[PDB]
Design a protein that fits this description.
- The complex is a heterodimer of chains A (10) and B (128).
- Chain A has 10 residues and is mostly loops.
- Chain A has no helix or strand.
- Chain B is mainly α.
- Chain B has a single domain (2-128), classed as Tetratricopeptide repeat domain (Serine Threonine Protein Phosphatase 5, Tetratricopeptide repeat).
- In chain B, helix 1 packs antiparallel against helix 2, helix 4 packs antiparallel against helix 5 (72-84) and helix 6 (88-104) packs antiparallel against helix 7.
- Chain B is globular.
- Chain B starts with a helix and ends with a helix.
- Classes of the chains: A little secondary structure (10), B mainly alpha (128).
């Protein structure tokens, strides 16, 4: 599962 | 002519460009097309956070949570709002809730949520 920044829209 | 997905995607590209009021407006057009998608509200709430428009972000988080009770980002953005409004206990609980949901949902945001919880607990403490 790729790490992704949370403060981003989906 | 533009689909709600199309408009959301446009919003996301504006968000990448740090054009937040614009991005928020595009999500608003997405909602106009389909107001029953929590992501649209979660996406706009983050825009509002970046614009220091905390009341508006809160309202959006609430709308998203009504549509999706499992929303990690709605709980997280809510917590970040309440933190910036000096509501630590509620903030910490919402960040903690986000942590739990992301585990339950196999979502990887690296150390973002624990980092935020530390920031929240430290700020709360710094105010005793």
């Amino acid at each position: 599962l790729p790490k992704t920044p949370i403060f981003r829209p989906d | 002519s533009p689909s709600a997905q199309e408009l959301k995607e446009q919003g996301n590209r504006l968000f990448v460009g740090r054009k937040y009021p614009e991005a928020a407006a595009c999500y608003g057009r997405a909602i106009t097309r389909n107001p029953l998608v929590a992501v649209y509200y979660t996406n706009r709430a983050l825009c509002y956070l970046k614009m220091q428009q905390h009341e508006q972000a809160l309202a959006d988080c609430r709308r998203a949570l009504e549509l999706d009770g499992q929303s990690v980002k709605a709980h997280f953005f809510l917590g970040q709002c309440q933190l910036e409004m000096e509501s630590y206990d509620e903030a910490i609980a919402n960040l903690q809730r986000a942590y739990s949901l992301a585990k339950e949902q196999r979502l990887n945001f690296g150390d973002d949520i624990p980092s935020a919880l530390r920031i929240a607990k430290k700020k709360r403490w710094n105010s005793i």
